[PDB]
Amino acid sequence: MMKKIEEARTFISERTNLSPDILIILGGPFIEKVEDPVIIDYKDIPHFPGKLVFGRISDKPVMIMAGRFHLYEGHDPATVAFPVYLAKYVGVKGVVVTNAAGAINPEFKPGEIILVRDIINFMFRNPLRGPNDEKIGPRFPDMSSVVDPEWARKIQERLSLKEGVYIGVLGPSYETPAEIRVFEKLGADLVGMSTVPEVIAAKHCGLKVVVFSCVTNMAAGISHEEVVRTTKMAQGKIEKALTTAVEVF
Amino acid sequence: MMKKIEEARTFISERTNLSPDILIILGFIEKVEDPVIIDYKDIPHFPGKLVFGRISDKPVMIMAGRFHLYEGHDPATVAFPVYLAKYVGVKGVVVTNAAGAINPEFKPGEIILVRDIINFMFRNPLRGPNDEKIGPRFPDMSSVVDPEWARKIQERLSLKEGVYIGVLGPSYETPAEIRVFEKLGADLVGMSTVPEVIAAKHCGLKVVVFSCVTNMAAGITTTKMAQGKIEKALTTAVEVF
Amino acid sequence: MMKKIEEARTFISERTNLSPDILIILGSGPFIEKVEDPVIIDYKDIPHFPGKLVFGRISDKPVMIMAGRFHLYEGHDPATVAFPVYLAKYVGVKGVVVTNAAGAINPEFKPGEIILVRDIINFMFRNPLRGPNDEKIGPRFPDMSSVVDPEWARKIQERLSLKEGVYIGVLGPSYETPAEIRVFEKLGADLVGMSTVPEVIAAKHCGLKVVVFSCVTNMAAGISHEEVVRTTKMAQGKIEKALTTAVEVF
Numbered sequence: 001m002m003k004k005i006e007e008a009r010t011f012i013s014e015r016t017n018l019s020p021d022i023l024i025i026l027g028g029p030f031i032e033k034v035e036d037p038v039i040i041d042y043k044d045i046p047h048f049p050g051k052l053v054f055g056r057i058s059d060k061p062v063m064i065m066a067g068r069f070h071l072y073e074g075h076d077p078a079t080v081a082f083p084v085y086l087a088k089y090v091g092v093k094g095v096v097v098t099n100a101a102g103a104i105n106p107e108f109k110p111g112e113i114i115l116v117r118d119i120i121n122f123m124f125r126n127p128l129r130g131p132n133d134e135k136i137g138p139r140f141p142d143m144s145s146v147v148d149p150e151w152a153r154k155i156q157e158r159l160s161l162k163e164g165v166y167i168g169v170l171g172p173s174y175e176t177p178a179e180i181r182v183f184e185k186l187g188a189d190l191v192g193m194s195t196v197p198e199v200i201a202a203k204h205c206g207l208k209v210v211v212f213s214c215v216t217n218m219a220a221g222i223s224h225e226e227v228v229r230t231t232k233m234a235q236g237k238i239e240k241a242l243t244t245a246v247e248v249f
Numbered sequence: 250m251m252k253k254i255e256e257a258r259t260f261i262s263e264r265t266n267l268s269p270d271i272l273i274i275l276g277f278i279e280k281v282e283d284p285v286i287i288d289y290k291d292i293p294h295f296p297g298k299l300v301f302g303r304i305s306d307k308p309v310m311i312m313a314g315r316f317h318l319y320e321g322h323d324p325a326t327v328a329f330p331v332y333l334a335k336y337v338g339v340k341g342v343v344v345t346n347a348a349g350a351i352n353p354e355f356k357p358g359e360i361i362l363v364r365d366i367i368n369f370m371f372r373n374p375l376r377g378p379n380d381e382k383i384g385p386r387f388p389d390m391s392s393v394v395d396p397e398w399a400r401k402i403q404e405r406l407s408l409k410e411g412v413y414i415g416v417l418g419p420s421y422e423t424p425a426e427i428r429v430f431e432k433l434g435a436d437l438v439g440m441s442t443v444p445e446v447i448a449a450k451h452c453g454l455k456v457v458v459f460s461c462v463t464n465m466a467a468g469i470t471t472t473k474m475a476q477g478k479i480e481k482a483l484t485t486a487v488e489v490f
Numbered sequence: 491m492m493k494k495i496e497e498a499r500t501f502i503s504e505r506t507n508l509s510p511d512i513l514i515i516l517g518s519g520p521f522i523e524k525v526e527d528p529v530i531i532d533y534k535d536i537p538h539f540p541g542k543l544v545f546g547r548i549s550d551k552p553v554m555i556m557a558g559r560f561h562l563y564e565g566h567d568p569a570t571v572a573f574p575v576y577l578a579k580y581v582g583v584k585g586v587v588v589t590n591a592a593g594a595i596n597p598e599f600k601p602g603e604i605i606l607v608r609d610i611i612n613f614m615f616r617n618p619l620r621g622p623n624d625e626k627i628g629p630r631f632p633d634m635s636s637v638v639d640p641e642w643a644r645k646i647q648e649r650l651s652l653k654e655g656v657y658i659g660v661l662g663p664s665y666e667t668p669a670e671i672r673v674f675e676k677l678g679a680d681l682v683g684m685s686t687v688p689e690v691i692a693a694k695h696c697g698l699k700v701v702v703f704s705c706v707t708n709m710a711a712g713i714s715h716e717e718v719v720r721t722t723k724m725a726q727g728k729i730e731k732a733l734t735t736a737v738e739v740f
């Protein structure tokens with residue numbers, strides 16, 4: 001594991017000397033804004049399971065995952081997490097995880113960006129299962145404060161986004177109204193199929209975390225023109241969220 | 250996957266030219282007209298017996314025996330027979346199950362029309378790469394149970410309805426676990442149904458589900474003697490499809 | 491499976507003729523130090539094991555102790571976590587005392603306390619029985635209506651009067667979020683830990699009586715080194731007495 005990380009790191013190092021401070025995990029508007037972009041295809045990167053883009057956003061050096069991994073694709077949880085460990089050793093200090101989510105909270109609207117304040121793991125998989133390298137992180141990571149209080153406060157002082165709890169589920173089929181009523185009872189505001197594994201990895205290796213959700217739809221039980229409109233709304237709202245997060249870090 | 254389906258389909262086609270409209274999944278068979286039986290042990294890529302024939306003049310494909318994740322099967326393996334049914338030509342699936350009644354109004358021996366499902370198995374037969382020719386990457390599960398099929402069934406039978414929660418098993422639940430499931434809104438608990446329903450929705454089949462209550466669930470306080478009620482439910486479902 | 495059991499059993503037999511009545515499953519003190527005529531067998535030497543077994547007597551009663559246990563977060567198959575319990579059955583035990591470390595969800599529980607677990611919720615979504623079943627070992631579909639032996643628990647409680655709670659088993663290894671813990675509280679859990687469920691399912695399967703004790707190590711998420719040392723000592727001595735009582739009243 002540590003050998004795989006080193007191998008991938010060396011590969012990257014030979015293509016960019018950037019010392020990025022922030023990893024950004026995305027599923028145009030924002031990527032197109034990156035300054036002096038260096039692109040590295042996932043297909044060329046040792047031990048990867050898409051493209052990494054390195055460069056600067058508001059003068060700050062960043063590493064962007066243009067494309068991410070999901071347990072519904074068949075990936076082992078550790079594979080999903082590996083790019084995050086790679087980021088740590090390339091030198092990042094924080095991770096912005098974005099996701100697409102169904103709104104369980106009826107006050108949320110499709111197209112909105114929600115600051116995720118906490119997570120629930122309903123995937124019942126964990127990238128840490130198996131023997132642990134204490135050089136990478138502890139056996140039993142504290143998940144008492146997943147979202148960095150200061151980072152979120154500085155972001156919120158600028159953007160004043162809605163906040164919500166995110167529940168991660170395996171997918172790939174969507175949820176039933178019965179399932180969604182369960183999640184509502186259990187306190188979730190948003191449901192998606194990503195985020196949890198990479199957030200667990202990030203906390204493990206000691207990175208700071210913020211998470212944004214883009215509401216793609218109201219969850220089950222709760223026009224193409226409308227998907228067009230909401231897709232446009234989210235793109236520009238997420239660009240501002242992401243830029244703010246980079247700038248205040 | 251599509252190759253395994255085609256191989257199984259050719260096998261079946263060489264034994265029955267029936268174009269069945271409905272797949273019936275059973276753990277009534279004696280009533281089937283002109284029955285053609287095919288052992289699961291002979292069918293390419295199967296994990297029991299298929300019975301083809303007619304019920305109230307309508308052609309059907311029956312799974313006399315089904316698969317459960319508690320047996321050790323991969324979810325995709327549990328789902329395969331359903332994809333095979335699709336390509337043999339069925340349009341609907343009637344899934345039966347045995348269930349424990351969490352709703353204390355239900356009594357052992359009753360047939361309940363299942364109105365929705367909760368997946369508490371945390372397994373999905375779709376995990377892994379998806380063939381878009383079979384069905385979409387992200388199936389809609391907003392209306393699993395076909396509203397019209399269920400309405401026509403209910404107009405005849407007026408069954409109780411309930412929410413079915415699928416669990417792995419094979420050990421039964423503790424009273425603490427059953428109180429969880431009650432809080433979460435489940436009326437019935439069983440160890441089947443969910444994987445084959447997910448597969449059906451994926452490949453675009455209509456679905457109805459019936460549960461036979463075999464017992465009150467843990468903490469609250471037979472499929473053979475219920476065979477008559479289930480026979481009527483099944484026959485109604487076929488007839489109104 | 492039955493062949494693996496017999497192989498391990500023969501290995502043990504050749505080192506101890508004890509006919510132990512009770513298996514005690516511990517995480518790793520004064521309790522082990524108290525065992526009489528202790529015979530120690532390393533897990534590394536035991537056929538088909540995934541720590542040390544210690545055989546001997548506690549208040550004159552012969553016992554088999556697992557000094558060290560297994561967790562699904564380590565990467566073990568559920569059936570592997572369960573195997574020592576089957577082995578215990580065939581060595582002759584009739585009862586199991588499962589200990590664990592747990593986070594207190596119930597705000598009336600304090601770190602360092604021992605709680606008598608009255609029932610379990612499996613939120614690991616793994617089961618050691620998945621796959622084909624040997625009916626000589628136990629039934630295909632074990633009843634879990636009364637996991638904790640009513641009489642054993644009653645005789646323990648008559649002596650100790652411990653708090654009781656519902657234990658939820660989860661995979662880990664990362665700890666829970668405050669959101670996750672509010673889920674568990676709503677679902678009726680008093681304690682959360684990462685062990686117990688697989689071995690208890692196994693035990694019920696093969697027909698052993700079961701009692702479970704939790705040692706509160708901390709309040710769960712969202713609910714001092716000196717205080718760690720204070721509660722650690724408190725727990726040790728409290729668990730010794732719980733364990734000794736359980737053996738004595740069996």
Ligand SMILES: Nc1nc2[nH]cnc2c(=O)[nH]1
Pocket residue numbers: 100101102103169171174175191192193216217218219220
């Ligand atoms: N699980 C789930 N994931 C999503 N990703 C985007 N929308 C949704 C949804 O409604 N449910």
Ligand SMILES: Nc1nc2[nH]cnc2c(=O)[nH]1
Pocket residue numbers: 347348349350416418421422438439440463464465466467
């Ligand atoms: N899980 C579960 N499955 C069942 N199948 C039939 N009865 C029951 C029950 O009580 N619980």
Ligand SMILES: Nc1nc2[nH]cnc2c(=O)[nH]1
Pocket residue numbers: 591592593594660662665666682683684707708709710711
């Ligand atoms: N899952 C879980 N396990 C534990 N083991 C000891 N303390 C804890 C806790 O707070 N949560």
Ligand SMILES: [Mg+2]
Pocket residue numbers: 533534535536537538539540
């Ligand atoms: Mg060995």
